[PDB]
Design a protein around this nucleic acid. Structure first.
Lengths: 102, 202, 209, 53
RNA sequence: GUUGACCUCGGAUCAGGUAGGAGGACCCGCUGAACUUAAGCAUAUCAAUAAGCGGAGGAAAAGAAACCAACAGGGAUUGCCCUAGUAACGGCGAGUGAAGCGGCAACAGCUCAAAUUUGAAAGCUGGCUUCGGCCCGCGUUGUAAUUUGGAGAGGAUGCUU
RNA sequence: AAAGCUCCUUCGACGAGUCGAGUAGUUUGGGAAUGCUGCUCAAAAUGGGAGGUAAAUUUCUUCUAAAGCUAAAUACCGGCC
């Protein structure tokens, strides 16, 4: 019983009165979940492969430098604002693990 | 197993390890013929994903194309028409370079059937592909029911009829409100909308 | 070239329409062909009904919301409630649809009853006559009158609600306090101002702090 | 060719009345195959790996 | 040094096989006009059409959702009636122009990559054979069984097929 | 030997020069750009696409792309009757 319908149309919560029920989650909706088998593989490959030229320019400019420029530049390469924001956040993690470890 | 790591490694095509390995191979190519046999696939994970198997009757060929854009072939520049369609230089072909590569291989091997193809390498004036072929007359093929569907006489030369994976992309073969005019065949629907039907009792 | 008081014409007849004209002179000839195919099919399925069982479904739009009709198949939850194996259902005339869900409880209850009584009316011949099994008919009640349509014998009983109802006086309810007309106007303007009111109230809380 | 004798040895025993795994013993062999080997080292069961160059 | 393997590339009137041409009314693609209409004409229209080129069948193609919706929610594809001369495009001129819902005909669902059989490549082409089988080869850079999101795997548990 | 059903702490692998973005030509009823193709850049894991007006912030609904098969209702007088 998520929400109770009012019973009259043309309102904030319009609808027809009924007894809604909760249902078991379908397996098709588990697409984006992380798996421990794929995190192990993706971590090892990053060590072997290394970084890319456009990442190397942002990561240097991201530390001891501007942060707006690091996000203007990322958008121009990746092409969209949403992906640029996520990529910049992930690279901030790699700098944190490197220097703060030892 | 190991095939999982190859999937992840091939995603990073800008790393120093991968970029070096593509440069050396492209020089190894371009010294052989335009079309030539390949002993074994160079991308074992990618070929396996598309139906390739390591048993008799499966062969691999590779080919390159010119990587440009279509220029309208006319004597000099004259077109003899209205100004709206007298351009010659910036026109474009309506099928992908991947499709042309598959088609030339089919004429070379006229007794086999084309399954799929994939991108291998590219250059300033060339793009390289590898094509998977299947022998429809081998006994080891007709025995297995997972593939013997291809031996039927209805799958003859499906390269130039637009039935492979790249052929379905070049046509609007998808569901939804976006692919309206070409969902079931562009020319078929144009016939349906332009027919005048008369019944006995009007 | 218009000349008098006329309606402006628009006749899409400037292409080569004459090349694509589809006259229907085979309307009665085609009908005979279908009737020959149905009775030929019915002979092949000698004791079985021709059709398949369908569930009850409501139309999906605000217009047509009132009426009901037949659907494609029963959801996997409906079959489980009635105790029918998933694999055995398609082989005894039941149609299954695996991409439909039961959001409410009214639809779920109606279909379960419609499927439960079908199981009671089913006669199931054994695979081998000399060795019958537990779930088979014991050969005593195999002889009975049968139906073949299964679309008329199991159609929608009534698609619409009853036209009217008659109730005794002094049982008539009282309306909304403001009235029916004013209840609609208030509900309309409340949704328009849901954003303006919320932020004005919220910013006051931070303003005082 | 060796596998044939072991299979025939099993057939004689199973007909007499003694079940399988009573005439044969646990085998110790070297592993091979790329996908097979990769799984072995992920479970820390391998002790030494040799790779071609 | 001798000798024996592996990978790549060739010869042969080696053993066994396969493609071309015809037809093209209907069907799947590429390429691509102008006459004409606008009372002139260049965007537009004729037309995503004629001619040209490639590939199949008795039908071809499509097809088991990265869909439609905003509802009390529908549920693979194709065709007929309606939606509709409608929303929309257009020297907003001449003109062009779909889709969702709804009724009916006919109805049917499925297999691969990504997991170690690892206590036993359990799989296959070919040759010879008295018909019981044997031999070389392909293959571990992966041939069978098992799994495909509707799930499933791994555990519990009693009946049934 | 193989198969079906009822429950569960826990696991639950899912397709890349692809998706997407910019620019150019063609096309569509698709209108700050419906589909297709050329060039440059080039992703992610509750992630991704869509929700018919461009952009930022916060919610919600619905499916699971980049591999594959399959009868019937439909067209046609070209071939044999």
């Amino acid at each position: 019983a998520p929400v109770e319908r009012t019973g009259l149309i043309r309102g904030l919560n319009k609808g027809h009165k009924t007894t809604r029920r909760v249902l078991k989650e379908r397996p098709s909706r588990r697409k984006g979940a992380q798996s421990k088998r794929t995190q192990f593989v993706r971590s090892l490959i990053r060590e072997v492969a290394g970084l890319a030229p456009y990442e190397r320019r942002v990561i240097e400019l991201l530390r001891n430098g501007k942060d707006k420029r690091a996000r203007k530049f990322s958008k121009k390469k990746l092409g969209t604002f949403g992906r640029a924001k996520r990529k910049c956040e992930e690279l901030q993690r790699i700098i944190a693990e490197s220097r703060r470890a030892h | 197993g190991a095939l999982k790591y190859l999937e992840e490694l091939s995603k990073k095509k800008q790393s120093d390890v991968v970029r070096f390995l593509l440069r050396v191979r492209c020089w190894e190519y371009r010294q052989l013929n335009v079309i030539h046999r390949a002993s074994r696939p160079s991308r074992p994970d990618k070929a396996r994903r598309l139906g390739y198997k390591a048993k008799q009757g499966y062969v691999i060929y590779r080919v390159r194309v010119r990587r440009g854009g279509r220029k309208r072939p006319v004597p000099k520049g004259a077109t003899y028409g209205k100004p709206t369609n007298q351009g010659v230089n910036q026109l474009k072909y309506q099928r992908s370079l991947r499709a042309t590569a598959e088609e030339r291989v089919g004429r070379r091997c006229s007794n086999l059937r084309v399954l799929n193809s994939y991108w291998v390498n590219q250059d300033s004036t060339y793009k390289y592909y590898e094509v998977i072929l299947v022998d429809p007359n081998h006994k080891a093929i007709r025995r297995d029911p997972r593939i013997n569907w291809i031996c039927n006489p209805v799958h003859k030369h499906r390269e130039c009829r637009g039935l492979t994976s790249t052929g379905k992309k070049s046509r609007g073969l998808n569901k939804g409100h976006r692919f309206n005019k070409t969902r079931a065949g562009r020319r078929k629907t144009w016939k349906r909308h332009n027919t005048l039907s008369l019944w006995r009792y009007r | 070239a218009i000349k008098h008081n006329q309606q402006i014409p628009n006749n899409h007849f400037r292409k080569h329409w004459q090349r694509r004209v589809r006259c229907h002179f085979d309307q009665p000839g085609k009908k005979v062909t279908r009737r020959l195919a149905r009775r030929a099919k019915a002979a092949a399925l000698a004791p079985r009904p021709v059709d398949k069982l369908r569930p009850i479904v409501r139309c999906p739009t605000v217009k047509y919301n009132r009426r009901t009709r037949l659907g494609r198949g029963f959801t996997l939850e409906e079959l489980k409630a009635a105790g029918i194996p998933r694999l055995l259902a398609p082989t005894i005339g039941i149609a299954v649809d695996h991409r439909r869900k039961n959001l409410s409880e009214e639809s779920l209850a109606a279909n379960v009853q419609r499927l439960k009584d079908y199981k009671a009316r089913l006669i199931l011949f054994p695979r081998k006559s000399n060795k019958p099994k537990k779930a088979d008919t014991p050969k005593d009640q195999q002889t009975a009158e049968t139906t073949t349509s299964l679309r008329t014998s199991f159609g929608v009983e009534q698609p619409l609600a009853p036209g009217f109802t008659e109730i005794s006086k002094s049982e008539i309810p009282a309306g909304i306090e403001g009235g029916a007309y004013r209840a609609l106007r208030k509900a309309r303007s409340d949704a328009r101002l849901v954003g303006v009111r919320e932020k004005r109230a919220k910013e006051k809380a931070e303003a005082e702090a | 060719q060796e596998k044939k004798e072991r299979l025939l040895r099993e057939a004689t025993a199973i007909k007499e009345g003694k079940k399988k795994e009573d005439v044969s013993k646990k085998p110790y062999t070297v592993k091979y195959g790329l996908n097979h080997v990769v799984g072995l080292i992920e479970n820390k069961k391998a002790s030494l790996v040799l790779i071609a160059n």
